[PDB]
Design a protein around this ligand. Structure first.
Ligand code: V7G
Ligand code: V7G
Lengths: 305, 305
C-alpha cells in the first residue's frame, strides 16, 4: 500500500536521447531508427526568433549544418525535413537501442512521464497530466527543449509530448511527435496566454478511490447525488463537467470498492463545499487530479514493464 | 522554471534487476558484477516466517535451490552467503549492464529514488525521503521486496535502500545494501511500530527557497528570528530542531536569493502559527519536506547524468 506520484521507468527513452546543434543553439533530440526528431527552432538564431520564417530557414540549411551527437559520438546527417513544428534528421545509423514505439496524441486529463534532459543527457523523470487548457505543469529550464513525454505498455513506448516552451504563468507547452502543438500555441519567441485551467474531475474521483483502497476513508459521507446536481457544483468550483463516459470509466474502481460512483461524487461535493478542515487525503491537503483511473488501478495492482 | 518531485533516470538500475526464487517465494534481486543481492527471507516459507532461524535455513540451502532469472535467462548460482538481512548469490556471469556503483548508508532527511519492481520487472520510479523515524512513505505491494533506492552522481549509482516490509501505518522499512535496517526494525512476519515522525525542517526551508526562485513569494514576511526562538516553535509543531549545520547548508540558497536563513526561518514560523489560509506554495497546500537543499539546487540549475 501507499500512494505515490509514480513515473514510468525511463531506461528505454534514455537510450534515445541525443544532442542536436545548429549554429550556437543546442537542444535535445529523439533518435528512433535512423531518424532524429527535435524542435524545428533549433534552426533559429537570436534574430529569427520573434517571427521566424521556418520554410525560408530550412531551405537554406544543409545536412552538414546539423551536428548530432549521441554521447561522445557524432552521427552523420544524410537528409532533413520539417513536419509542423518538428525537424526530422535522417542519419546513416539506426539507433541500436530503439525500443518498440509509437507516436500518440493524448487527450486533456491523460497522464505521462517526462524525461527532462539537458545537452542530450537525462536530468530526471516525473509524471505530468495534460491540463484541460493544454499546458503541463512541468519543471523545465533553458536547454530542456526536445525533452519528451511518454507512456509505456509492457515493452512499447508511446511518445506523446515534445517540449517547446514556457508560458508567462510558469507552465509549459509543446507538441506531439508529429510536431502539432497541444493547445493554440505557436513556436515563436513571443508572449502567449494559457486559458483558465480547470480541475480534472474524473481524476479527482479516481484518486478518492485510491484513498479508500489505501484505508483513508474519513471523507465518505452519507449522501448520493445525480450527475446533473454534481455538475452544478463542479461548474462553481472550476471543475470539468462530469460526463457519462467518466462515470463509466470509474466503473471498475467502483465495483472493486463497493462504493457507487454517484456516492463518491456526493462525497466530492461535500469536500468542495466544506473544504478539508485541515485534514489530509493520501498525504495531500489539496484534491489531486493528476492520476487517471488507469493510473490508480496500475499502481494499486502492481503492473510492470 | 516550475518545481516537481523528480526522480533520477532509472535506466542504469533497470539493467540490474532480476528475480530470485526459493521454493514458492519470488522476490527481486540486484545483479551487480557476479553477485545478486536480495532480502534473506526469500529462504523462508510460511512456517518459518514469524520467527525464522536464518542461520539454520541458510546452512541447509544449496546453490541449486536458488532460481535466478534475468529476463528469460537463468543464471547459474555458484555460491551463497548471508550479510545481516541480505543474501548474496555468486553467479557464474558478471552482469554486462553493471554501472559504476557504490553502497551508501544515508541519513534521515536525505532523499533517493525508488524503482518499484515485481517479478524482477520495473513498475515505476518515484522520489522518497528517509524519514526521521527511519521509515519511507513508499508505494509497495506484495512482491516488491528487493526493490532498491538509489541516487545518481554523473555516471555513478549509489545504492542506499533495499525494500523489506510494510509497517501497520502503511509506511515502509528496509535495509542498506549491507543488509542493516534503517531504524530498529527486524525482518520477521510480525507487527512492529514506527516511532512518531517529525517534519524535516531543513528540507522545508530548502523548498521555501525553491518557491522564491520560482516566483512564489507571498509568504516572505517582515521579521527575523534566532535559531533558539525558532526551535521553540519547531518543538511545538513536531519539526526537527534546526541545527547550526542546517543553517550552514542553506547558505548557498540564501546567497543566491539574498534572503538570510534566519529571515526564512521567521517566515516559516509565521506559516506554522498562522497556517496557509487556503493559499498554496509551489502548488502544495502543505509544507513539503522531501526536497533537500542539494535537490533544490540540482533541479533549479539543471544537473544531468
Ligand atoms: C527550449 O529549451 C529552447 N530553447 C531555445 C533557444 C534558442 C532557440 C530555440 C530554443 S528551444 C526553451 C525551453 C524553455 C526555457 C525556460 N523553460 C522552458 O521550458 N524554449 C524556449 O526558450 C522557447 C523558444 C521559442 C522559439 C519557442 N521560448 C519560450 O519558452 C518563451 C518565449 C517567451 C516570450 O517571448 C518574448 C515571452 C514570455 C514567455 C516566453 N517563453
Ligand atoms: C516483500 O515483497 C516480501 N514478501 C515476502 C513473501 C514471503 C516471504 C518473504 C517475503 S519478503 C513484502 C513487501 C510488503 C507486502 C505489502 N507491502 C510491502 O511492502 N514484505 C513482507 O511481506 C514482509 C516479510 C517479512 C518476512 C520481512 N512482511 C511485512 O511487510 C509485514 C508483516 C507484518 C505483520 O506480520 C504479522 C503484521 C503487520 C504488518 C506487517 N508487515
Amino acid at each position: 500500500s501507499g500512494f505515490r506520484k509514480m513515473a514510468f521507468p525511463s531506461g528505454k527513452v534514455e537510450g534515445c536521447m541525443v544532442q542536436v546543434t545548429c549554429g550556437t543553439t543546442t537542444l535535445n533530440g529523439l533518435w528512433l531508427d535512423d531518424v532524429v526528431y527535435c524542435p524545428r527552432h533549433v534552426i533559429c538564431t537570436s534574430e529569427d526568433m520573434l517571427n521566424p520564417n521556418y520554410e525560408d530557414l530550412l531551405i537554406r540549411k544543409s545536412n552538414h549544418n546539423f551536428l548530432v551527437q549521441a554521447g561522445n559520438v557524432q552521427l552523420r546527417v544524410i537528409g532533413h525535413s520539417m513536419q509542423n513544428c518538428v525537424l526530422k534528421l535522417k542519419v546513416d545509423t539506426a539507433n541500436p537501442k530503439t525500443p518498440k514505439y509509437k507516436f500518440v496524441r493524448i487527450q486533456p486529463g491523460q497522464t505521462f512521464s517526462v524525461l527532462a534532459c539537458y545537452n542530450g543527457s537525462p536530468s530526471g523523470v516525473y509524471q505530468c497530466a495534460m491540463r484541460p487548457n493544454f499546458t503541463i505543469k512541468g519543471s523545465f529550464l533553458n536547454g530542456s527543449c526536445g525533452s519528451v513525454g511518454f507512456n509505456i505498455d509492457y515493452d512499447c513506448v508511446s511518445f506523446c509530448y515534445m517540449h517547446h516552451m514556457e508560458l508567462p504563468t510558469g507552465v509549459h507547452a509543446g507538441t506531439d511527435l508529429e510536431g502539432n502543438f497541444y493547445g493554440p500555441f505557436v513556436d515563436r519567441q513571443t508572449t502567449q496566454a494559457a486559458g483558465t485551467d480547470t480541475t480534472i474531475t474524473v481524476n479527482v474521483l479516481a484518486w478518492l478511490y485510491a484513498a479508500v483502497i489505501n484505508g483513508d476513508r474519513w471523507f465518505l459521507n452519507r449522501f448520493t447525488t445525480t450527475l446533473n446536481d454534481f455538475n452544478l457544483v463542479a461548474m462553481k468550483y472550476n471543475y470539468e463537467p462530469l460526463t457519462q463516459d467518466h462515470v463509466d470509466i470509474l466503473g471498475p474502481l467502483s465495483a472493486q470498492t463497493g462504493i457507487a460512483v454517484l456516492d463518491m461524487c456526493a462525497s466530492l461535493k461535500e469536500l468542495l463545499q466544506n473544504g478539508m478542515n485541515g485534514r489530509t487525503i493520501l498525504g495531500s491537503a489539496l484534491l489531486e487530479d493528476e492520476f487517471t483511473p488507469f493510473d490508480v488501478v496500475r499502481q494499486c495492482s502492481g503492473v510492470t514493464f
